[PDB]
Design an enzyme around this catalytic site. Structure first.
Site, short mmCIF file in Angstrom:
data_model
loop_
_atom_site.label_atom_id
_atom_site.label_comp_id
_atom_site.label_asym_id
_atom_site.label_seq_id
_atom_site.Cartn_x
_atom_site.Cartn_y
_atom_site.Cartn_z
CD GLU B 41 8.56 -15.74 -1.44
OE1 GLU B 41 9.14 -15.87 -0.13
OE2 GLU B 41 7.64 -15.91 -1.28
CG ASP B 106 5.27 -0.01 5.44
OD1 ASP B 106 5.30 1.23 5.02
OD2 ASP B 106 4.61 -0.69 4.51
CG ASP B 108 2.02 2.72 5.36
OD1 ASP B 108 2.26 3.40 4.55
OD2 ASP B 108 1.89 1.31 5.57
N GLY B 158 5.17 5.32 -2.44
CA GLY B 158 4.09 5.56 -3.50
C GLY B 158 3.25 6.34 -3.40
#
Ligand SMILES: [Zn+2]
Lengths: 106, 381, 242, 119
Positions: B41, B106, B108, B158
């Site tokens: 996917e 992840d 953050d 990013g």
């Protein structure tokens, strides 16, 4: 169909009769049994993630329609002619819902 | 960088810079399993925040085509399903199941907001990036020692943080329950904004926690005592006082009134705690609450999670999601990461080697080394 | 191995995976069914009355197993005919009770609980050698760590297992299991992980084994409930099983 | 002219008259101020058939997949050439439809495209 064999005897106490005619439509609704949700030994129950099938949707529509008609009937001060119409409609809905299983069983 | 200039540059990049060959090598995993790339996917986010998923492709040519055609703003990679996502409408209900996916984390910076003083929200600076520098070491070591995962790709997100893709075949077949177990094992800082004390270690320090504290210690003096200055003034050291039992708090306050440097205040706090023994781990609890990574178990638990693709372009900073070399981690600088505008300026200043003329080359090189290791593992096995 | 024996019953404990294929008598059927019902009811009563780790529980359960002649202790002699008989009993009786205890979810749960309890007890009575034998025969492939590797990770093991003393730890031997099987242990960080393997003491391993067992047993009960119409037609076995 | 009538019953004779169904019911007549019985014949009800495409062309004589992907143009050509003439079918209308199937016949995908032939 499983039968709890009669317990032959005499009972001098009150006896309660419960109608289970709505058993199989209820099973079809609750477990989401459908032509589109069951793989084809007795197949395993469909996962809860699956959306409602077509046949459960039809049974649900009939049950909800009967509920709505009964609620309208409960309204007091209603025309007797409309009362008869709603009673007949409710009877027809119940008959159809109870007879639905024959499509799969027979 | 001008984000109105994003729609101008995106095509060129997707045409002459996005490393499609290595990307297919990655997601195809040496063709061993049939339909592996074909059942993957993808999801695209186009202009004006238009989201599409259940995108699948037959091979590299189809992917290159449809991507260059759509010019998406965001690319997310998802699970490998039982069938091709493109035909999920055709699959009988309940028979469309996510079966394999990399184990992903992840981290953050926004989740560290209650414990950093230099920046807030989406702002980052050299004084706070050391936290990420700690996380990558703390986590990656576990993944290489406790769990034995051998192929681990760390990628800059990013802007605010970093992602980790753990791609061992074993890690790709882990159930949801196993993923949740892995996430909870790695997770220490538990609690929300309504809790003050988020770490309560037991009397026995589990070896993993000992090794995480050992990793933290190497950096703690620079990060917390020099850079962050978590004991600069009362408004801040009141928190750390709030993190220790009241009994010594008064004793500390007077001491903090006679200290000129936060390193001195840390020495004083350590001495006072040592003098005061069940609380001998309290300094460790404070260090963890200021340094240990925070993990969103929802990101890593679910198999169907769509995470930012490597070599994506950040819609706001414009930086490229570039892989981070583990060895050169201490030299990594999230502000020198190539932006799309810089690499289009570089491209329009000079076929399969065009990217070697940009500042993107060493990061594609790190990715190529990681893929070479994966290929060696696929063969040797 | 007197007349009609074989290697069909290697170990005392079993996961009850393969149904019996023999032709038994109605009297044997009834005797086995009732005997295992007595055993399971005794297990339930002792579990309610006592703590399953208690010594009274162990003593009473051993007494019941001896009284009903079920396999509960190993024997490092060989597969003696009598032993074989006992094991055969256990194997057939279990499946008979499955047929008895698959009609209703309630019943299923009850059965599962009792069976698990019994299995735990029996595991608790297995010597390390026997334990490994079992873990091999069922392809569980859990490795018992060497002494040298244990010394190599002595401190890690000491800090991994809660409430383990230095000397007492020296007196204990661990097992190496893939971490996918120790989910419930790893998740709260109560067992050391090294290179994808958890080092589980002799106390926790039973838990993993039981988990596997329970999974299997639940599946089996479902299948049995699915295969009920074939048995209801046998009047001989209807009064009993129903 | 519009003919309004309340229908109660229908009759079909498959063997005798193909494609005709009779509907019986009530029609209001003002000249008599009453409802009278009426029969309406509905004719030209076309047979509708759905052909399920294969994944790869198969040689019926040998039963071995030929590996050629089968588009619906191939199915149309096969029907026009082999099936249409072999069963004395002269004129028909073909169309591409998307239909679901979740019933008791093996090897029929849940959702698929069919060739709808009306004749
Ligand atoms: Zn900062």
């Amino acid at each position: 169909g499983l039968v709890l064999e009669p317990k032959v005897g005499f009972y001098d106490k009150f006896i309660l009769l419960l109608d289970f005619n709505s058993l199989y439509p209820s099973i079809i609704q609750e477990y989401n049994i459908c032509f589109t949700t069951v793989h084809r030994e007795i197949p395993e129950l469909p996962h809860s993630d699956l959306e409602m099938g077509i046949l459960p949707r039809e049974i649900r529509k009939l049950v909800e329609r009967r509920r709505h008609v009964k609620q309208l009937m409960k309204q007091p001060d209603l025309n007797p002619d409309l009362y008869l119409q709603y009673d007949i409609r409710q009877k027809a809905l119940k008959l159809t819902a109870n007879s639905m299983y024959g499509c799969l069983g027979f | 960088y001008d984000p109105a200039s994003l729609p101008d540059v995106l095509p060129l990049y997707y045409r002459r810079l996005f490393p499609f060959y290595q990307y297919f090598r990655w997601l195809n995993y040496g063709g061993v399993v049939k339909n592996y790339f074909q059942h993957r996917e993808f999801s695209f986010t186009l202009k004006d925040d238009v989201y599409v998923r259940y995108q699948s492709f037959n091979n590299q040519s189809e992917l290159e085509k449809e991507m260059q055609k759509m010019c998406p703003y965001k690319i997310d990679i998802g699970a490998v399903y039982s069938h091709r996502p493109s035909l999920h409408n055709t699959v009988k209900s309940g028979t469309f199941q996510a079966q394999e996916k990399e184990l992903v984390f992840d981290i953050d910076m926004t989740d560290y907001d209650d414990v950093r003083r230099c920046c807030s929200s989406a702002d980052i600076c050299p004084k706070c990036w050391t936290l990420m520098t700690i996380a990558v070491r703390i986590l990656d070591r576990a993944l290489a020692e406790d769990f034995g995962f051998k192929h681990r790709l760390w990628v800059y997100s990013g802007r605010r943080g970093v992602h980790c893709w753990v791609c061992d075949d074993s890690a790709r077949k882990l159930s949801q329950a196993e993923r949740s177990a892995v996430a909870e094992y790695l997770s220490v800082v538990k609690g929300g904004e309504e809790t003050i004390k988020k770490v309560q270690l037991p009397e026995t320090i589990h070896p993993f926690i000992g090794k995480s504290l050992k990793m933290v210690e190497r950096y703690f003096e620079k990060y917390a005592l020099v850079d962050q200055d978590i004991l600069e003034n009362k408004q801040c050291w009141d928190k750390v006082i709030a993190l220790v039992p009241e009994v010594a708090r008064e004793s500390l306050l007077r001491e903090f009134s006679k200290a000129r440097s936060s390193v001195e205040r840390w020495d004083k706090l350590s001495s006072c705690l040592e003098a005061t023994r069940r609380y001998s781990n309290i300094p460790k609890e404070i260090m963890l609450q200021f340094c240990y990574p925070r993990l969103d178990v929802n990101v890593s638990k679910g198999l169907n999670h769509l995470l930012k693709s490597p070599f994506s372009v950040h819609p706001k900073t414009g930086r490229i999601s570039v892989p981070i070399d583990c060895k050169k981690l201490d030299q990594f600088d999230p502000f020198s990461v190539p932006t799309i505008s810089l690499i289009c300026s570089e491209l329009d200043n000079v076929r399969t080697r065009d990217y070697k003329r940009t500042s993107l080359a060493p990061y594609i090189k790190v990715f190529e080394q990681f893929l070479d290791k994966l290929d060696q593992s696929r063969k040797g096995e | 191995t007197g007349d009609r024996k074989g290697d069909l019953y290697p170990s005392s404990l079993q996961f009850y995976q393969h149904p019996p294929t023999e032709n038994i008598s109605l009297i044997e059927f009834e005797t086995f069914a009732i005997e295992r019902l007595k055993l399971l009811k005794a297990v339930e009563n002792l579990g309610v009355s006592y703590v399953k780790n208690s010594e009274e529980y162990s003593k009473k359960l051993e007494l019941e197993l001896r009284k009903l002649k079920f396999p509960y202790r190993p024997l490092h002699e060989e597969i003696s005919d009598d032993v074989y008989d006992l094991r055969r009993k256990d194997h057939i009786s279990h499946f008979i009770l499955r047929l008895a205890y698959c009609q209703s979810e309630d019943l299923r749960r009850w059965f599962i609980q009792q069976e698990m309890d019994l299995f735990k007890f029996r595991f608790g009575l297995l010597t390390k050698e026997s334990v490994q034998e079992f873990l091999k025969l069922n392809d569980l492939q859990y490795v018992a760590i060497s002494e040298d590797e244990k010394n190599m990770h002595k401190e890690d093991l000491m800090n991994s297992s809660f409430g383990l003393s230095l000397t007492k730890m020296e007196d204990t031997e661990f097992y190496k299991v893939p971490f996918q099987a120790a989910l419930d242990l790893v998740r709260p960080r109560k067992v050391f992980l090294w290179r994808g393997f958890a080092f589980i003491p002799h106390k926790d391993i039973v838990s993993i084994v039981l988990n596997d067992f329970r999974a299997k047993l639940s599946k089996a009960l479902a299948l049995s409930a699915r295969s009920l119409p074939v048995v209801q037609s046998d009047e001989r076995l209807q009064p009993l099983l129903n | 002219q519009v003919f309004r009538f309340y229908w109660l019953d229908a009759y079909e004779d498959q063997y005798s008259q193909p494609g005709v169904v009779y509907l019986f019911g009530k029609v209001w007549i003002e000249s008599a101020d009453a409802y009278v019985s009426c029969c309406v014949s509905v004719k030209n009800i076309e047979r509708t058939v759905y052909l399920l495409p294969r994944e790869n062309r198969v040689q019926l004589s040998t039963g071995k997949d030929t590996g050629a992907p089968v588009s619906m143009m191939h199915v149309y050509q096969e029907f026009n050439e082999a099936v249409a003439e072999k069963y004395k079918i002269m004129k028909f209308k073909s169309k591409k439809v998307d239909k679901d199937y979740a019933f008791e016949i093996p090897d029929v995908p849940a959702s698929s495209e069919y060739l709808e032939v009306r004749y």
